[PDB]
Amino acid sequence: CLSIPNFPVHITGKTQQLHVGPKPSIARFSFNPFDLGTVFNRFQSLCAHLEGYSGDLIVNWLVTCSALTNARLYIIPVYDNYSFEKFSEEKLIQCKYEFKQISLVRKGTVHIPFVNWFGSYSRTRFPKLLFYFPNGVSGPSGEKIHVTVQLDRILNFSGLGHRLFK
Amino acid sequence: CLSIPNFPVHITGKTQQLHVGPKPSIARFSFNPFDLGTVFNRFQSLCAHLEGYSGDLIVNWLVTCSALTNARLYIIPVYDNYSFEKFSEEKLIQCKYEFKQISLVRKGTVHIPFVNWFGSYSRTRFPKLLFYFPNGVSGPSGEKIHVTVQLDRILNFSGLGHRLFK
Amino acid sequence: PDFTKIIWPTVVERNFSNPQSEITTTLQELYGDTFETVSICPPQSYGGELLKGK
Amino acid sequence: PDFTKIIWPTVVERNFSNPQSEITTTLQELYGDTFETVSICPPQSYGGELLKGKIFFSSTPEFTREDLVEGKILASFKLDEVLSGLGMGAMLMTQIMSGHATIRVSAKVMLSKFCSFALKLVYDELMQLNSDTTDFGKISVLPGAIFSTQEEEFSFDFELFSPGVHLKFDNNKLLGKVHLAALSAPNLTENMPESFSCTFNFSIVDVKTTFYNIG
């Protein structure tokens, strides 16, 4: 298997809107570089022939709101490709998750350690990062906050396999 | 020549409007106490017979805006009576000019050292202070910021000449 | 410097170097960057690690 | 206290004493008073202070044999053009709008070992000699020196004079006029070149910038 200590990919995900309101909101960002779009990203140009890879992800996350907008933010990893519609805040506080007020901390970097039951990420196995606003978002009269993430790099990269070039 | 170490004049210039917008803006304040208006200022009451004077100027400057208004401010001296319509920000950063964000610093005192090629200020030779907003002013929906300066005093004053009382 | 320059094949290209980021229009205490690591923590008052041995 | 109180005539009246100012409705870190001093700073990576001691202009004009009569002006240089040319030395100098400049000028003519004539290098400071002057009454008295053009290369310094304290450079077509004047016919005139080549190198001896151009 090829090993890459640092592998920059600079892939930015789609920016996701959130209208202001009291309803609990979730923004899901899957981190699947094997996912193809209009252009092939730096990951696919060099390691798309692989069947699966392994390594820690670094993600730059950003929440753009007004200066008079309040919200609590829970950044939650989701491994092994599970689907969560609702979160139990009791469970999050029991796991010592700390929420951040987007009126004070609305920029950050998330290190995602490698966690997969199968042993590697793939086209079908990838981590998810869920931005969970439990109280919704309280903003000025029709605001939409935007949550945008960028997969910055992959640390301690390892990859195996050899797919067919379709 | 008569010499005055400290000479208070308390002359306030005209307050100048600036509409909010992205266009680069300049507010010019000439400091010409020989300029007459409706009333004779403290400078003219005692030293209007002079042909020209010399000394460092002290100017209190003030920018009145809202609390949700952003702008970068370059306070630029202009000596020898030159006219600048546009400024080269490359040239300003090369001369180590520092801009101030009016959402953080919107009051100040500017010391203007004596700089004139002719050797003195006069009716036609005077310094100018230019408040240059390179990115315009970003304010709440029709705001106008006001820039107002006051010539506080003249330090190390010296004056010569004897004009005719017209 | 000629063609006999030895080339070390690296995957890190210098088309994007140190991305500096500086706060401009407000105070830092009003705008903070957090660096976290999203690891899995079993809960405090329950979780199978209490049944270990039982 | 009576009328014999001695009066010291001061211009500072007590109708406006210490103007205190206090922040009320917000935090200080959100409302700051800056006290600055707007002085002139020459730029960091350019500005005439880098040319101090170095050449900034160079021409190589020519003059014919028939122009080597006594008094004839051979080459001329307006200082307002030498300081506003197209070279890199000049473009660094046109950014200085006002200040001081002491300028060195050097002349050098390439000759055989046969011909040798004397030349005066004059600094006409009020620009009173057009290039079509064969006077020698004006040449003999202008500030400058004579030199032999075969074994020698002659240079001298001159300070640009301002009526005021500094010298406004912007739009100043009255900075002086340097000339190379012929004092005598050549040594030998038969079977000789019909034209010569003189090199002029203007250098900066000293520059001070009292105001710098900004766009």
- List the single residue in D30, D36, D163 with the smallest CB-CB distance to B104: D30
Cβ contact B84–D211 (<8 Å):
no
Backbone φ, ψ for residue A66 (5° rounding): -80, -175
Q: Does the CB of D9 have a partner CB in chain B at under 8 Å?
A: no
Joined tokens for residue C15: 């088309």
3 state DSSP class of D30: helix
C-beta of residue A2 within 8 angstroms of C-beta of residue A158: yes
Structure tokens at D29: 């870190």
Chain C residues with CB-CB distance to A110 below 8 A: 36-38
Q: Rounded to an integer, what distance in angstroms lies between the CA atom of residue B130 and that of residue B74?
A: 8
Measured between CB atoms, does D91 come within 8 Å of chain B? no
Asked if residue D82 lies in contact with residue D89, where contact means CB atoms within 8 angstroms, the answer is no
User: Rounded to the nearest 5°, which phi and psi values hold at B147?
Assistant: -110, 125
Alpha helices in chain D (DSSP H): 79-82, 88-91
Nearest to B135 by CA among B22, B18, B17: B22
Chains that touch A (3 or more CB pairs under 8 A): C
User: Which experimental approach was used here?
Assistant: cryo-EM
Residues of chain C with C-beta less than 8 angstroms from the C-beta of A94: 43-46
- Burial annotation D17-50 (CB, 10 A radius, 16+ → b, else e): eeeeeeeeeeeeebbeebeeebebebbeeebbbb
Q: Which of C22, C24, C27, C30 to mutate to test the interface with B (most CBs of B within 10 A)?
A: C24
Residue A137's beta-bridge partner residues? A21
Among D109, D125, D122, D87, residue whose Cα is nearest residue D204: D87
Contact present, D175 and D135 (Cβ < 8 Å): no
Q: How many CB atoms lie within 10 A of CB D115?
A: 18
**Kind of pairing between the strands at A128-133 and A144-160:** unpaired
Q: Residues of B with CB below 8 A from D34's CB? A: 100, 105, 107-109
Q: Sort B158 into a burial class: Cβ within 10 Å, 0-12 / 13-18 / 19+.
A: middle
The full DSSP string for D108-149 is EE---SS---EEEEEEESS----SS---STTTTTSSEEEEES
Min Cα–Cα distance to chain B from C25, Å = 6
Contact B150, B59 (CB under 8 A): yes
| Cα distance between residue D150 and residue B78, in whole Å | 50
Residue C53 is classified by DSSP as T
- Taking the C-alpha atoms of residue B42 and residue D46, their distance in angstroms, rounded to an integer, is 43
Cβ within 8 Å, pair C38-A111: yes
Phi, psi (5° rounding) for residue A153?
A: -155, 175
Please indicate whether chains B and D are in contact, defined as at least 3 beta carbon pairs under 8 Å.
yes
Q: Quote the minimal CA–CA distance from B25 to chain C in Å.
A: 19
Give me the residue label for tokens 């000025």.
A140
Cβ neighbours of D163 in B, within 8 Å? 118
Any CB–CB contact under 8 A between C37 and chain A?
A: yes
**Cβ neighbours, 10 Å, residue A65:** 22
Dihedral sign for Cα atoms in the order C8, C11, C15, C18: negative
CB of C17 less than 8 A from some CB of B: no
Strand partners of residue A57: A112, A154
Question: How close C42 gets to chain A, by Cα (Å)?
Answer: 6
Assigned token pair, C14: 């210098």
* CB–CB contact B113 D34 (8 Å): no
Interface of B with D in 117-136 (CB under 8 A): 117-119, 129
Instruction: Please count the residues of chain B.
Output: 166
Q: What angle do CA C46, C48, C54 make, to 5 degrees?
A: 105
Element (H, E) at B44: helix B42-47
Residues of D in contact with B125 (CB under 8 A): none
Residue with tokens 């500017």: B110
CA nearest to C45 within chain A: A94
Q: How many CB atoms within 10 Å of residue D122?
A: 22
Q: C28 in contact with B at a CB cutoff of 8 Å?
A: no
CA distances from A63 to A78, A85, A92 (A): 20, 21, 21
Q: What does each C-alpha distance from D76 to B22, D181, D194 come to in angstroms? A: 51, 9, 20
CB < 8 Å to C27, chain B: 104
- DSSP bridge partners of B78: B128
Q: What is the resolution of this structure in A?
A: 2.9
Query: Which among B15, B14, B13, B7 is positioned nearest to B42, based on CA atoms?
Result: B7
Closest CA to D75 of D64, D90, D87: D64
